[PDB]
Assembly symmetry: C3
Homo-oligomer: 445 residues x 3
Amino acid sequence: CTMIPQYEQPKVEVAETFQNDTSVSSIRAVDLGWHDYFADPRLQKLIDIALERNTSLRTAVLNSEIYRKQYMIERNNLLPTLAANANGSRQGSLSGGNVSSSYNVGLGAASYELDLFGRVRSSSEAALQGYFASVANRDAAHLSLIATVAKAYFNERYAEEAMSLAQRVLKTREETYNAVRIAVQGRRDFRRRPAPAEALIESAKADYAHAARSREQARNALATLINRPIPEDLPAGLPLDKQFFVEKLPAGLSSEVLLDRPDIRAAEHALKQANANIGAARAAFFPSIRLTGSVGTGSVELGGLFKSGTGVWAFAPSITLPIFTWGTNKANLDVAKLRQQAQIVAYESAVQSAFQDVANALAAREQLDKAYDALSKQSRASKEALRLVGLRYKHGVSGALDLLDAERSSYSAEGAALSAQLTRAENLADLYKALGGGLKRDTQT
Amino acid sequence: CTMIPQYEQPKVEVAETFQNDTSVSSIRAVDLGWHDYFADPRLQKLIDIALERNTSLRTAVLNSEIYRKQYMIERNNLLPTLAANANGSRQGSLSGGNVSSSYNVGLGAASYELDLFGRVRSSSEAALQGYFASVANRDAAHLSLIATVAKAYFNERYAEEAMSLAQRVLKTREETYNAVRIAVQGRRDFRRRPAPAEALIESAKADYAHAARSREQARNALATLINRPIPEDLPAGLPLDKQFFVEKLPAGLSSEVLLDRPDIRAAEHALKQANANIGAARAAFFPSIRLTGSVGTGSVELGGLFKSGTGVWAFAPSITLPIFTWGTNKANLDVAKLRQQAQIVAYESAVQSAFQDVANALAAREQLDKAYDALSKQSRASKEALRLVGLRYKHGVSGALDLLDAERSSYSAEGAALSAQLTRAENLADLYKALGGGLKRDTQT
Amino acid sequence: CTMIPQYEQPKVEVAETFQNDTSVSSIRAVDLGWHDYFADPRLQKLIDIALERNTSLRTAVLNSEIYRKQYMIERNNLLPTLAANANGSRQGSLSGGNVSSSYNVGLGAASYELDLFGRVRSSSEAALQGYFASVANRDAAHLSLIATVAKAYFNERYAEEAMSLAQRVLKTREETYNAVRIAVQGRRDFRRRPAPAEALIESAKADYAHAARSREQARNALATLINRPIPEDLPAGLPLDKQFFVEKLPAGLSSEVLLDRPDIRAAEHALKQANANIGAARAAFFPSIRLTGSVGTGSVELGGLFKSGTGVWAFAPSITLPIFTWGTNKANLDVAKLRQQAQIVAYESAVQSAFQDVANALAAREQLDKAYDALSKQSRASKEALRLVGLRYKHGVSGALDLLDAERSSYSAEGAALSAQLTRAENLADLYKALGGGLKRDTQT
């Protein structure tokens, strides 16, 4: 009989629903394939190779394999190991008298512990739950990869557009600063013209560099995640506003969304493992029995080996039970119980963190949308203001400074739009990941 | 006799005083209870539940309990373990001749190592200092919790006021943008009015969102630290300028402030542990002695068991001393000495980091006060400028742009005041924590 | 014979060259001594003491020493351990009959495992490669120190100049705000003068504090890295533009630059270690042989000990071979192979990260130079604009606001130049470090 306590799931005090659920889509995030979630064909292609070559995933998938093997050897302790032990012995007197030789060549199993009280059985169950938890950690490593490779690609495309944004503002100032010298001469506060002229163009250059630099940092971080230098045959990609298929993931009930999270099911298996370790410590109060056996030829001389009459066998069953261990037996159980008491608060820590991981992602997608829409219409307005003054200068103006200031306000309000355009895209990848999504590639029946 | 070297505290080269001590209060930070340090009744309430339910603290307090148990079992190696070992044996010839059976059912202790040279004693001392250090780490986990839950609450209240700040600037622009159209018609650089009009209102909306989003992130991080969704029956709280009772903590002498730090006393116990491991390795040059004993009934047949005459006893004291170990004995000691040589530089690393942890907190509270006072009077000035122009527009003005620009300068200079109002509050919680404060709830006799 | 597989270096798919190599210098970064790389005599002095006293380096250099010792004891398993075991035994009847005593005092080696199949040899090789890898990690800890202490010093000097920058802008506003009241009375939009007047001076004060605070944080972090409070006898140092000797490091071929990196050679030794662990598991299919021997005096009474005729000796060679282990033998090898399969993907992860570590440092030094040059000429232009208006106000002006606005634009454009002046300097220290540089102090023959 085994002595492992029944598994009762811990009561994590947490809200039953999220105060930010607005979606109605049937398709769950976990159910949704990432290939049907991420839009950019370039990004879709990148994941397929990274999912095949990523070191962290390769490592995480190997560790789960050795935990399977470590389990398979622990289950083998329930079976007798057969060994062919051939040994010899020899005594003799120092003074120069007599000697004695005994040669035993035989086969036999040494101390098979008959697990009557599920001590080896429970300790083998720990190896299984240890493996089961590692598999879930392998899944968590799978989801963390797709989220990371996506957010690192969004940082690239942002910088791509950040360069081009500062590229054409260097081109639109190019046609104006030469025009500000061929234009009809203005006032003497024209001195307030080359200073912002320089201020616009030389900030635009500093921006292009920062963009071009962060572009490479995203480019290089991508080559690491795919274990390969970036290939050539790739579609030019889509802008940040076209990085996701039109869909917002639902997160129904908190109990529902907990089941999909790998890091959560990894916490219950690591707990079930600690339960098994109790069944091993609780069986220590019980007697342990061990069986020794052997066959073969016993002899005094090598010549007599394997000759008729020398055949012997053995059977030595030895059992034992501790009567007073000075509380050590009680103590080792207490440890096994505390080791398990820590796995329920680790399970609680896992849930409370997992809930927060989602509630933030929901609050972000809501507010990174409202904040983005504001910064976008601001860009449109500042762009419109630029065009109006763009005609004023074309006709009769008292200052290119007006037009020039309008260029910078339109440039700054547009760069601030790209900033929120990325932050919204990044969180979208986190929302998918933290919702358990990214498991399968394609959504199917 | 034991062979553990006497504990001499390492000489950490560090300044004796801090160049930022300005306080004169008798009440030490460590002596000061956090309930008498933190002002907000809402925050005071939050800590009491988090201190009872936090996972990280629950884990840290469990680990110190298993280190007590792991110690209790190591002290038990100084006592003989009694076991009732009943065993049987049986030999026999293969050809079909004779057999032999010997059944021994008895009681006895197996190999009690009489620790004459404090080898088990020292190795048991390591288990104690290991436990003593874990207790100090449990205290460091206690202090880190209060500091974290406080700084996470300040981030909430900041966002609460950040929303309301942008809320009324949306309300004050509301009454002006409708008024800027019903006002008497202005010039043609009125075109320089709706652009900043849009720029003010649409930045205020982007601010409210960022504030409302970071509000939830602080709200969610709070629900994690308390292992519970946030309750309802709570006082509305106090503003950031009312988060601390009027008091600045003193940090007298560097030697003085080192003693209160848990992470420091944890470094000396982890060192004392390494000292104990030397007393075990240094006793390896000495002979180890072991005692075997047993009583019970020896027999050839089960029937004879527990029948008169079968009573036997045993006493096998076996001692041994290594003569030449090929330097392995010297090597294992060298390791034990190096393992201890690393605990003094870990102690040094602990102190040099602990000193920096305080010196920064002192330099910050000084400069986050001077920088805050400047940003605050700037807000007052910009607010005053707004009111003056607020009357100009009310009478005879040539531009709502003046008034409108004054709104944004007053809004920006006020939001920059809240930013420094939080950073000053956060560091205040760190100063208390890094000074050893936060141990007891209430300051007492 | 040993059974450790030959070492074949993994094929890391990575670009052969960097798309940012522009230097032509023969002197490699690794070949270049840091004393000939870092310019500031104050910084050069600081490293020499930190390299002697840093805790993290002291720890890293100790761990490599214990790995040498742990190896030396594993090599000793190939040699017999001699022990002088003197033991006694005693049986007796409970009823009150007969007793029996046997006293054996002798010398002998217990179970020397004759390693015929390189099982101990291979397991000892793992201890060597484990040590070899720790040495490389000790080098990586050496390089990480110089990089860290340099970047922490640049942050200090930045703040030093940041304070002085805001110090003289408080001095130049000092002579103007008293002059703005003694100047001839201006218009009624003079109201648009004290608001930016306050805005300039009160931002300059907030800047000085932030600078003075971050100055101490860099000052304190420096005292930690050198395990000592900062001394006095030190040259005042050089500005950020004078922190490096005029030289840009070359990074020829990717294969070339991989060899200098300590973290890379640490990954191959940790791999070679896993190779050795296979030679131990692959030898488990083979029989293990063990030799027991002893000499000394056997007796029934203590008096007979060491008296003629009692001299006995022993020689018990015992060998054994597992026939069926239920796949456990195959499993333990599979683990040893998977443990090694993980060290090649850890080697791949090491390389892909090491390449990125350099490619970013190259792209940064290129773009942090172009972005810096732009922000610098912007400062010159804004400074020039200030002087021109500085003469306008000196003669006939309609607003100190013009001059006052010119002060802030010149102040802000100069502080933004120092910001890029530091970021460029920091990356320069990382480029040197990530290129394997910082090993030797002085570049030599």
